[PDB]
C-alpha cells in the first residue's frame, strides 16, 4: 500500500513509517515502529539513533520567566538503530518485513512500545497573536547520528516526524446520565425539585446534545430564567494540580414558572468550534501542522487511572442553572439560583483511516 517517508536535509538519512496516528485501546496501543535507511559510505563510524519524545509545552518559548523552562518531558526512549544491536533482536512486524524487502540492505528497523496511561495528543488553541511550537502535549520521533548519545544534535543530518495518539468511542454505550436536586429556603418548607437527564451517554462531535429537564416549584417563588451550558473541564497536571473551565456552548430560556407549579421541557444544543475561536486556552485534539482540528475529544480514562502522570485530562459536562427571584418583603433583582451538572463523553467512532490535513 502506501507508507510515509521523509529524508534528512543531509539527504542520506531517511525514515519510513506506516501509520501516523496510533490508536489507543483502553489498555493497549499500536506499537510505533518503522525502518530507517542510510548510505553507509556517509556513516564512517557514527551510530544512528532514533528517539521517541513525549513533550509537553505549557508556556510559549518567548515567555519571560528567568531560568524556568516550559517544556516538560513525559516519556522518552532511545534506540541505536545502527549498529543494529546484535543482542537486541526484535520481533520485526510484517510491515517492517515488507519494508526491508522493498528497500536495500542498508535499512534497519526500530520499534517502540508505549506506556499505557498517557494522554491523547492534544494542543491548546494558540489564539490570534502568538506563534511557534504551540502549547499542549506532543509526540515526536527523531532520527539522527552521533558517536555519543549526549553529543550535539547536528541539525542537517536528522529528521523528525510528529505523531498523534488518539482514542475512539467505547463500543459498549454507558449508562444514561442524569441527576436531580432540590432547594429550600428560609421562606417556607417546600423545596422545589429539579431533575435533568441526557438522551444518551456518548456523543460524537456535532451530534446534537439533548437535555431533558423537569422542575417542581413548590416554594412561593418564581424561577426567572434557565441557563443550560456545556462546559469543558480541562484538568492540567503539573508539579501543582490546576483545572480550567471554558463554557464550550450554552443557551438560555425565559421559561418562568409560578410558585407551587411545575414544568418540564427538552432543550438541545451542540458543542462546536466555529463560534469558539477567540477563547484562548481552549483544548484541541492535536495537530501536526497548523491544521484546524476539532474540539479536543474527551479522554476516556480507564477507571481509577493513575491520573497523576497524565499531563492533560479533558472532560465535558452539561450544567443546568435555574435563576429565581428572591423578591418580596425582602428581595429584589438580586437573588440566588440552583445548578446541577451531568458529565458525559464526546469522542469519535472507530473508522478505518484518518485524514492527513486534507480538503
Amino acid at each position: 500500500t502506501r507508507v510515509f517517508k521523509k529524508a534528512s536535509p543531509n539527504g542520506k538519512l531517511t525514515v519510513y513509517l506506516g501509520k501516523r496516528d496510533f490508536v489507543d485501546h483502553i489498555d493497549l496501543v499500536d506499537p510505533v515502529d518503522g525502518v530507517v535507511l542510510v548510505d553507509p559510505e556517509y556513516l564512517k563510524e557514527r551510530r544512528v539513533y532514533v528517539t521517541l519524545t513525549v513533550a509537553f509545552r505549557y508556556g510559549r518559548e518567548d515567555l519571560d520567566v528567568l531560568g524556568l523552562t516550559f517544556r516538560k518531558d513525559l516519556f522518552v526512549a532511545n534506540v541505536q538503530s545502527f549498529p543494529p544491536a546484535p543482542e537486541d533482536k526484535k520481533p520485526l512486524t510484517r510491515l517492517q518485513e515488507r519494508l526491508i524487502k522493498k528497500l536495500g540492505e542498508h535499512a534497519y528497523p526500530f520499534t517502540f512500545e508505549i506506556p499505557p496511561n498517557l494522554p491523547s495528543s492534544v494542543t491548546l488553541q494558540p489564539g490570534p497573536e502568538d506563534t511557534g511550537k504551540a502549547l499542549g502535549v506532543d509526540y515526536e520521533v527523531k532520527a539522527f547520528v552521533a558517536e555519543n548519545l549526549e553529543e550535539k544534535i547536528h541539525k542537517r543530518n536528522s529528521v523528525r516526524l510528529v505523531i498523534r495518539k488518539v482514542q475512539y468511542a467505547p463500543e459498549r454505550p454507558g449508562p444514561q446520565p442524569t441527576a436531580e436536586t432540590t432547594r429550600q429556603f428560609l421562606m417556607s418548607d417546600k423545596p422545589l425539585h429539579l431533575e435533568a437527564s441526557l438522551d444518551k451517554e456518548i456523543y460524537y462531535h456535532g451530534e446534537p446534545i439533548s437535555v431533558n429537564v423537569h422542575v417542581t416549584n413548590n416554594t412561593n417563588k418564581t424561577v426567572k430564567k434557565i441557563k443550560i451550558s456545556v462546559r469543558q473541564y480541562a484538568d492540567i497536571v503539573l508539579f501543582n494540580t490546576a483545572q480550567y473551565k471554558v463554557p464550550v456552548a450554552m443557551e438560555e430560556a425565559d421559561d418562568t414558572v409560578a410558585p407551587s407549579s411545575t414544568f418540564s421541557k427538552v432543550y438541545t444544543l451542540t458543542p462546536f468550534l466555529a463560534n469558539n475561536r477567540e477563547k484562548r486556552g481552549l483544548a484541541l485534539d492535536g495537530k501536526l501542522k497548523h491544521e484546524d482540528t476539532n474540539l479536543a475529544s474527551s479522554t476516556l480514562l480507564r477507571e481509577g487511572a493513575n491520573r497523576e502522570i497524565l499531563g492533560i485530562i479533558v472532560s465535558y459536562k452539561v450544567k443546568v442553572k435555574l435563576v429565581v427571584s428572591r423578591g418580596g418583603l425582602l428581595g429584589d433583582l438580586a437573588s440566588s439560583d440552583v445548578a446541577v451538572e451531568l458529565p458525559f463523553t464526546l469522542m469519535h467512532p472507530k473508522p478505518k483511516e484518518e485524514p492527513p490535513h486534507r480538503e
Epitope: R2, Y204, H205, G206, E207, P208, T270, F272, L273, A274, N275, D292, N294, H348, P351, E353, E354, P355, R358, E359
Partner: antibody, heavy 119, light 108 residues
C-alpha cells in the same frame, strides 16, 4: 437519511436566486455541504462548500465571490444565493453531504435542480 | 494549483459479463485521495469507492481499483446491465475538488 433540494429555475444574467436544500437526519454540525455543477452533457464541476463546524466556506474560483453560500442550523438547511450570473453557470446543480469529520466522498446526493441563465 | 484530471478513455463500448478497467491520471500527486462515483442518465450520482481503494458500504465487490503514481484506475469484474452507466473519478486532497472528464460505458 433523505435530503431534499429546491429553489432553482430560469434566471436572467447577473441575477440572483437562493437555491436551498434540507438534510433530513443530518445535524449540519457533522456533515459539511457542497454544491456541484453539471453542464448538460458535460463533466461534473464542483461549485461550493460549507463546513459549519468550522464556519469555513470555499467557492469556485470561477465564480469566487459571485455567489454566496450559507446555512441555517435551526432547520438543518443550506442556502446559496447565486448572484451576478456569469453565463458559464447555466447547468444543473446538485447539493450533497460529506461527513464533516473525516471526508469520505459525497456519500449522499439530493435530486439537484436545473438552473439556467437566459433571456 | 488547480489540479486537472484525465479520465482515459473518454468512452467505452463493452459486453455483458466482461471485466473492464478505466483509468484517470492526475496533473500532480494527490496521494490516493480519490473517489469513484457512478451516475446513470438523469439520476443523481452515487459514490462507489472512496480513498481509491475502499468500496462503499452498499456496492457489489465486483468494483475495485488502485493507484500508481498520479494515475488511478477502477475496474468492474462483470458488466451487468445495471452497471452500464457513466463513471467519474474525483480527487479531493487539494481544494478545490475537481473531477475528471469522466467515462461512459456503452454496449458492445
Amino acid at each position: 437519511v433523505q435530503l431534499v433540494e429546491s429553489g432553482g429555475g430560469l434566471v436572467q444574467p447577473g441575477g440572483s436566486l437562493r437555491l436551498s436544500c434540507a438534510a433530513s437526519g443530518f445535524n449540519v454540525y457533522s456533515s459539511s455541504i457542497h454544491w456541484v455543477r453539471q453542464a448538460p452533457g458535460k463533466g461534473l464541476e464542483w461549485v461550493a462548500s460549507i463546513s459549519s463546524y468550522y464556519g469555513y466556506t470555499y467557492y469556485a474560483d470561477s465564480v469566487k465571490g459571485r455567489f454566496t453560500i450559507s446555512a441555517d442550523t435551526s432547520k438543518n438547511t443550506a442556502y446559496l444565493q447565486m448572484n451576478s450570473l456569469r453565463a458559464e453557470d447555466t447547468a444543473v446543480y446538485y447539493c450533497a453531504r460529506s461527513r464533516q469529520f473525516w471526508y469520505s466522498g459525497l456519500d449522499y446526493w439530493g435530486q439537484g435542480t436545473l438552473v439556467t441563465v437566459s433571456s | 494549483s488547480d489540479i486537472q484530471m484525465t479520465q482515459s478513455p473518454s468512452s467505452l463500448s463493452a459486453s455483458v459479463g466482461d471485466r473492464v478497467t478505466i483509468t484517470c491520471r492526475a496533473s500532480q500527486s494527490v496521494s490516493s485521495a480519490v473517489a469513484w462515483y457512478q451516475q446513470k442518465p438523469g439520476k443523481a450520482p452515487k459514490l462507489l469507492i472512496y480513498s481509491a481503494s475502499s468500496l462503499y458500504s452498499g456496492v457489489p465487490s465486483r468494483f475495485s481499483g488502485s493507484r500508481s503514481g498520479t494515475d488511478f484506475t477502477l475496474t468492474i469484474s462483470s458488466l451487468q446491465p445495471e452497471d452500464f452507466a457513466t463513471y467519474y473519478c474525483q480527487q479531493y486532497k487539494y481544494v478545490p475538488v475537481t473531477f475528471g472528464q469522466g467515462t461512459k460505458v456503452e454496449i458492445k
